[PDB]
């Protein structure tokens, strides 16, 4: 009698089957995209003779239960809560699925786990063969229905200018199951308006899209602006299934299989310095099997005021060579994937959502790997006594300032490239001898990998 | 392929196979007297069926929990499998020779929306979802046109 | 300067190397598995030493030829010619000289010969070290070549349904020679549209096929459709080659070995009554070291009216323990050899083609041996004057009608089967005595082995 409608169901995400509460369960933005659903398998049998009479038979068979299929995209909506003051995706669950099996802990720092800065997931902890298990609940108007033991299996997340910022999941569960009675009310569960103002208070637009691409051999960091992009997390589960001849059958578990994070930027050619020209012509140049890059996109944009924005950071990642696409301003497109420094090493990449980000805040992210911890920005080698030059045989320990103040690495490296008349120590104690009357330099490089440089040239002479 | 769809009128579609197209100069007979005539192309006009009024019969012969479904739209089709032999040789060419009709298959697709009312698409689909069975025996009987108490075409 | 293609060949059957006319010359229509050619054979000689510094050096002779090998696949295509209007298969030498060893002559009544009725192949004149000789002459585009002396060795024909009647050929020849000059004109021997025209209106159907299994030893007809088989007629011939060390040689000679009608007949389980289970059932419940089964396997199918049909027919046959071939439907293998029923006597089994075989006509054929002689199909015993009973010493001269009128055989046999109250001699004078009180049957059989059965119940009585 009563018809469902699709724009009154709603989506719940739960870790348990009973007792649920605010921290088990919560309501998804999902949008009007949803769609899922169980098939199944069948077999026909016919005969073929050869007779006068022949048989024309056929006599079908139900087999077993093919995975069930659900989908739904929701807006990328970082915020803070009340409660905490710590800044979390409203779909902080499912990225923890999408990361790491474990139990959910946002206090931790493997998987999807927060901070007072900024929300961060990592994949360190991913090395599983089974990721941590969902209960998707579908509320129709008022009819119950739930999918049993769902895992993520890819969360497609879309980049592109003139689209609002949105993320599309797409997972499989071991049987949709309708329920005729209220697992939870729902009301209570279910966001308030004040926790909805707090998140609608913070959007992510794609057209602020800034690409921070910088290789590790040469260090040659470009300029491109961004015509669109895409970058999914793929887990390749495969659900097992029985094979019994007599009675159906519904899958058993499941075995993640080769994690894949690909991405594909698309971006108009440029003849400026540092621009796509220049980073096509040199990967076209140096054809090289393996490729290291610091990838860093960033949609939202990057502003001196706090400004929501979400930032992926694929530390040493494979850039395929790019091709060229013929339309009317040439845009080209590069396909990259983010390989892991070793293949059970993890840090793969990790993901930054929030919605007060300053330009220090998503540099640090990037370099440092969290939105809290600081690290240098620029050095200057401070000589022992505001020296300026030496004097043949004569010891000068060097020293050295780092800013900011609140860095938490501080400690810097110690070499001499310019010149050959002195020796630097780990302590940075530079000595000099006989025979040395050139001029050399000193070098300064934090071990966080900022970027930053200290230099300074000493005028060594002969002495009196 | 006859199709069973509500804003769409009562239509059937064949497709079959001949051993070879054959083109004429003469007429093999007159069409107008073979032809239908206007009369009984008004009898036939007549009568028509409409897919708009479509009422399902469907009863589990395990159960006999006959259904109420409305129909959304539906389509099912009765295939011979038929496949000509053709003889190979290379000096000259060949045209099909008979043919031998394989498996009999009568499937059909239906549409309709859930329900929650007793013995509706939402309790079949739970049924059906809860007694998961490989062997199904039912009571299928799809009256294209409607039924009525006065005289009515249907199918 | 051309290069030749497999589609452009045309294969000629020969008896004669000179003198070709359309009697010992004719085209057989081949496809594109034909294949033909002659492999030769060599030696190395390689000196084997030890020592340090060896001989490391070797050495290769032509020592022999081996024989030709042919093969090519045709239809079973039955057809009556306009010339004769006798019943005739086009190639009819390749069946004479796979039946027979003597010179061809469709008169006769031993090897491939015709009829006004179907064309029937028999191995009744087999015995001979040496069957027909053929020569293949094989025309490529524009170049000739021919096998000298060839001899059938065996011929296939696989009931595969859905498919046509094919049989594949396959023998040995002395030399394959290539001829510069043409041998004959083709566009003459080669057969004409109008011929082609009449051969393409018969055709036979392997799905089409009704086997007629019946046990010799307990009277029992099978009804087994098919699914698929295949039977042989093989010669097992040798060739010889000498062994001469100056120069090669070429075989010279050859000697035909066993020869062989073997079977193998795939069927489905049926529960039905006289099915593919009683069958099986039995075979394996007897155990028996030899079997006596009547088999006559029926391509094309039997019909009311006229329908083409190549009929193979095993007498007296020998069938294997079948075994189950469990499938997704469960079937069977009836695997048989038609043996004869001494040695020297040759007629293990015989062939029947024909464009037009009625019911009656491939009945008659099984059970007489040629589709012409027509043979008894019923029969009702008539007495002595239309008479009911007998008394106590009285003769009862018993006589025979039979069906139908023109059967080639209509005498009877003569018996007594229930009851002790009379007896009957070679002509049907029934006998009996005194002291007669019981009922007494009598009973007659034909003598061309129809199977038909001519039965009365007399009532004797004491007298009056």
Not at 186 to 196: N, V
Not at 230 to 256: A, E, K
Not at 269 to 294: A, C, P
Not at 300 to 307: I, Q
Request: aromatic share 8%; proline share 3%.
């Amino acid at each position: 009698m009563s018809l469902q409608l699709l724009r009154n169901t709603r989506i719940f995400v739960s870790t348990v089957k009973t007792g649920h509460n605010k921290t088990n369960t919560q309501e998804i933005l999902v949008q009007d995209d949803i769609s899922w659903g169980q098939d199944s398998n069948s077999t026909d049998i016919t005969v073929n003779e050869a007779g006068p009479r022949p048989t024309r038979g056929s006599k079908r068979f139900n087999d077993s239960l093919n995975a069930a299929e659900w989908s739904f995209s929701t807006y990328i909506l970082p915020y803070k809560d009340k409660n905490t003051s710590k800044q979390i995706v409203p779909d902080y669950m499912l990225w923890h699925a999408l990361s790491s099996g474990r139990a959910i802990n946002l206090e931790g720092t493997t998987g999807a786990h927060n901070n007072a800065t900024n929300f961060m997931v990592n994949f360190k902890d991913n090395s599983y063969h089974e990721l941590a298990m969902l209960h998707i609940y579908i509320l129709t108007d008022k009819t119950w229905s739930y999918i049993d033991s769902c895992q993520i299996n890819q969360a497609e997340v879309n980049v592109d200018i003139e689209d609002i910022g949105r993320v599309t999941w797409s997972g499989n569960g071991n049987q949709l199951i309708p329920l005729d009675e209220q697992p939870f009310d729902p009301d209570q569960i279910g966001i308030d308006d004040e926790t909805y103002m707090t998140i609608q208070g913070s959007y992510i637009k794609n057209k602020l899209t800034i690409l921070k691409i910088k290789d590790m051999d040469t260090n040659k960091s470009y300029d491109i602006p961004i015509t669109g992009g895409t970058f999914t997390i793929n887990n390749n589960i495969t659900y097992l299934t029985p094979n019994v001849m007599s009675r159906v059958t519904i899958p058993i578990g499941s075995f993640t299989g080769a994690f894949e994070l690909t991405g594909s930027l698309t971006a108009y050619l440029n003849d400026k310095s540092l621009g796509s020209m220049e980073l096509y012509k040199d990967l076209i140049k140096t054809l090289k099997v393996v490729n290291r890059f610091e990838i860093a996109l960033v949609l939202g944009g990057e502003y001196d005021d706090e400004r929501p924005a979400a930032i992926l950071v694929a530390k040493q990642a494979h850039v395929n060579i790019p091709t060229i696409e013929t339309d009317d301003v040439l845009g080209t497109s590069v396909e990259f994937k983010a390989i892991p420094s070793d293949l059970d090493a993890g840090d793969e990449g990790y993901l930054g959502f929030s919605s007060k980000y300053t330009r220090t805040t998503i540099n640090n992210l990037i370099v440092n790997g969290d939105g809290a911890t600081d690290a240098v920005t620029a050095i200057t080698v401070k000589s022992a006594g505001n020296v300026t030059t030496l004097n043949r045989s004569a010891t000068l320990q060097m020293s050295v300032e780092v800013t900011p103040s609140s860095a938490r690495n501080k400690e810097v490296t110690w070499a001499i490239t310019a010149g050959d008349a002195a020796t630097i120590n780990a302590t940075g104690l530079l000595r000099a001898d006989a025979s040395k009357t050139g001029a050399v330099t000193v070098e300064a490089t934090a071990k966080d990998g900022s970027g930053v440089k200290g230099t300074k040239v000493i005028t060594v002479t002969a002495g009196g």
